[PDB]
């Protein structure tokens, strides 16, 4: 994974129960951006019609 | 995932389950206990009558909902008719005792 700064301070209840509060900078610089590749299949058969 | 009106099973005609095939959540057995503990009979009646097991029930519900009339019409669950037919085919007689 990545590594970044962290402070242990209860912020306005947004980390109420093990929740994570995140900053806009990490999204700006794409630290946790991932890539997913999927495959789709189209099949042609010879129906009696 | 979120389902409004989609596929239905073959033998019992209930909505399927699983996001990938677009099926609805299973209204499990314990929450039935909870809802009947609350005492909201109509809510569970809708849950097990007009949502999953009424071929001509959910259609009328959808029609009159589009018509702006949220009125409920009940019906005998299809999964109960399949049960009756199966237990009758097992060789044990079973009838619905009408008035």
């Amino acid at each position: 994974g990545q590594n970044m700064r962290v402070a242990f301070m209860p912020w306005n209840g947004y980390n109420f129960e093990d929740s994570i509060l995140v900053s806009e900078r990490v999204v700006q610089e794409d630290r946790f951006t991932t890539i997913h590749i999927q495959e789709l299949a189209c099949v042609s058969r010879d129906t009696k019609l | 995932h979120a389902r409004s009106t989609g596929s239905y099973s073959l033998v019992t005609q209930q909505p399927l389950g699983g996001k990938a095939q677009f099926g609805g959540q299973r209204f499990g057995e314990m929450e039935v206990w909870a809802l009947e503990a609350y005492g909201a009979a109509y809510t569970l009646q809708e849950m097990l009558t007009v949502k999953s097991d009424d071929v001509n029930g959910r259609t009328k519900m959808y029609k009159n909902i589009v018509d702006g009339n949220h009125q409920m019409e009940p019906g005998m669950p299809e999964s109960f008719n399949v049960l009756l037919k199966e237990i009758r085919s097992l060789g044990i007689n079973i009838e619905l005792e009408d008035e």
Partner: protein, 50 residues
């Protein structure tokens, strides 16, 4: 950039995360000094010594 609840440390019995946090801060401080002095290019031998 990351804010975490502090009350989740003691009862969860995981104290090593605090030591990891301190170690990471020390490592980043060393690297920060290295890059800060690198911007001015004092001496190759000075970097070697440090």
């Amino acid at each position: 950039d990351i804010v975490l609840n502090p009350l989740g440390v003691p009862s969860r019995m995981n104290i090593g995360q605090i030591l990891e946090t301190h170690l990471g801060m020390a490592a980043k401080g060393i690297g920060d000094k290295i890059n800060a002095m690198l911007k001015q290019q004092q001496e190759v031998a000075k970097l070697r010594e440090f």
